[PDB]
Amino acid sequence: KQEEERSKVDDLRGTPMSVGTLEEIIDDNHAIVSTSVGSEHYVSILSFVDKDLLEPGCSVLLNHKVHAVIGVLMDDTDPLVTVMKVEQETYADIGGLDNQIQEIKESVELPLTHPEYYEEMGIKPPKGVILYGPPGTGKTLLAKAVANQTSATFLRVVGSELIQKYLGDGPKLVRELFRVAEEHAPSIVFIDEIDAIGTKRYDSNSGGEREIQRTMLELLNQLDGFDSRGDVKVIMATNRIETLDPALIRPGRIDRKIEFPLPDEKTKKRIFQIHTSRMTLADDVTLDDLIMAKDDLSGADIKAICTEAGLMALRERRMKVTNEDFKKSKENVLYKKQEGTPEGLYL
């Protein structure tokens, strides 16, 4: 019966079930496998259990004695599903770009959700935008707020999440996440800090000249090359502009680009009231003095400064926060800051 069929399928299997990546679709009941060291014979492939479901370059079950194709690999999962396969919205504290929000909207949601305009005005959707600037000003923050502000299930993909030194694990995660983006849904595969090709290295990593080079080749051929977009929103924002390979600076790969200054007085007071709200404010302290002195508050000093000001105060268990506590909080946060002459020597 069926139990006997399963017992026979197990009879075909050798107790030590090695693992070998398929090389090519050759269906004369034998394939050309590649185990952890690349055992590539014309080993038989079990016919009844699906022999042709898995593609070439995919892990399958292998024998030990003859390394025969034992079967399709088990359901494997990458360590990023919880971040990518997603189970703050527009703005919980309006007071920042107040515009790049709208622009990433028009560049991602409007194209993706209603792509009935690119034939309405002979146009093409933005296949890629880059957003960059200081180490935290409103680049990835907007993307995080855009994840909730969308009619689609966004995906979070840390640029370093794709750094696994296993053989082809780079291309493996490319394949997995892209089979997601294409055969899960029209998703929002957001990948940040993707500028990691320029001027550093790792200890938990081998020679990148020949380890992640073909990995990036696979990733590029996947995203904006072959098996092209269609409607697969995978936009690549950054922080820098320089250290990158111009193989993608050319359009097509990515079309638009956006930067991020640091917020202005109008937005300084905004994010102040956003953060200074977390404490019973001693209103005699002058936010505007902090705003003009710290006139280049990317967005970390504001948060850190107000949190540490609350800490300074509530160390004394006071409700109000005198100005000196704010001074100490900021100056601890704000090291190495000398904005006087120059200049410094004028008006």
């Binding site: 792509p115 009619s151 689609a152 055969e183 849904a185 029209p186």
Partner: protein
Amino acid sequence: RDKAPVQPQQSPAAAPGGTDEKPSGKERRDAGDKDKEQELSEEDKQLQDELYRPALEELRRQIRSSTTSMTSVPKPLKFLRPHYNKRFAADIISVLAMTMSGERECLKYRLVGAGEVAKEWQELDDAEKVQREPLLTLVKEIVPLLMEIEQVDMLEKDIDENAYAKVCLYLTSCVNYVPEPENSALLRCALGVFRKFSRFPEALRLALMLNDMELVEDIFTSCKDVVMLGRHGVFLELSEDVEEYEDLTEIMSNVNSNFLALARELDIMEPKVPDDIYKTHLENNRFGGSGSQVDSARMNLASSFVNGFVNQDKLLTDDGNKWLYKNKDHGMLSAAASLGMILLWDVDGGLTQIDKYLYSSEDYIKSGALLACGIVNSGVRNECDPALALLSDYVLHNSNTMRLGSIFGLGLAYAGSNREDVLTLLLPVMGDSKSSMEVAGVTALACGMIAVGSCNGDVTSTILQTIMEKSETETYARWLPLGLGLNHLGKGEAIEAILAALEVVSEPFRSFANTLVDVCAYAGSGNVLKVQQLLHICSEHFDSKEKEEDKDKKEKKDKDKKEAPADMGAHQGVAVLGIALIAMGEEIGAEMALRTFGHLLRYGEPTLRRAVPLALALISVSHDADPEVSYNSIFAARLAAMLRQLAQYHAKKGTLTLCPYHSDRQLMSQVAVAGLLTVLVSFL
């Protein structure tokens, strides 16, 4: 300061000493103590001691609620009867009394069932009214009606906060987290406090759920007291079930002569179609694009159906002739009724357009013409008469197909409280039970749709005779349970499932009927017992009861649909992949609908690849034609082109839209079954 002077005051049992330390305890109780009250194991020895032993119990409950307990903490308080908005008042009221009286009330609500607990509950409710804090006080005082009196004792000034937040979150957790019975008292007290309030839509959804005829009279006399009004009748008809519209129209016909015009018919549709021609502007090249699909007389059939459902005019109505002559018998049923689809308005125009196909040369022409006459409107009840007399044939005559059409059109048109004349004529419809499945199909369907939304259904003799005559001869056993469960609809606590298990259980046909009755008894609330029942009985060997039994999901758990995705596709009973396909349905089509459709689109069976476009294009009413072109590339037999045209159609709790797709859920049959497919009128 140091406890060295103030700690040893607990060793003596002096009455003046205790009674001058315990008020000092109240004074130092602003921060509790110098610390987290480590004076416990040195004061627990004083439990046996007995002037101000009320203050002694105050100190005792303070320190015990300061460390931990569940029952020994509130005893001193209920033994205290607290006597004798500050930070110390914050301490011993807000957080302390919250946790304290909360565990006390939970223990007394799960253990016994005195008045002292209601006293504490009222006192803390007034205290939190002074605190003005909802969303934790309300949700904690939910489980102790106590709720009704708390509402009518709190609802005086705060209108927005209480009503919006409390009512919405509690109704959400009442269809999601709370069971049904207490939601009835919720409904009653909300009805009261909203009769005290404005913004009638709250009472209108209170009626949408309660299914009440007093609420509709009150909201009508008040919405005449509060003079938009046309739009108000429009979405009153859009919100009302089938039971309350006839009761409301007759209780009005008893007593401005315009609420009769609005909330029965002919006024929800009077402003719509003109403004559709005005502000909506569809082009004519879609008629062609969807119509330029090469003629196949069955692909041409589906294309005629699609372009019949375009709605900027009735172009397809008057598109010459020979399109219906090209069609065949059941295709002629669909196309002669297609003219009613393009004309679901114009009461007078409906007759002046269909009388040319009424009583005409072809039997299918006249039957589908009566079908369209029933389709076009639901308030004229004058097109019923010319058919009602004919319907009787007793075996296999023209008026049997005309009876299919007109019985369905009258179940659609008029669905009163209990309309018996159509039932006295349906008794000869089921008593005949012509070999065509559609006869008994529409018999049960009309009986249900006029009996849906009933007061917990009914155990009346009609569906009982129907069960008898169905068990007499074993799609009949599939679509007669359709009407059975439809008559079961409107239930909140009906015992119909038990009587059906008593009379019906048999070989898996009537066992499937029993599980149909079960599916139509638990529309959805918090009753996860039946959910684990379904989880286990899904492993039943019968691969057919699985279908509807798991398809009940999209009804049971529709509100917080985030858990609706299950492992149905990961299951291997391919009918269960179709189950999930149904479970997606026709709503706004979230990205998770597309998540299912990503794989459910690419399928090979001409039945489930035929079941997926229905749900996909019905859930999305470039972006949308993308699965259309996807199927165009997927297939390029005839079923593939037919499902493609079905999707082309679909592209361009009300019971009105609850039955038809479950009726269609037996799609694996002939196009004669698809001959009655043109009855799914559920969109505006």
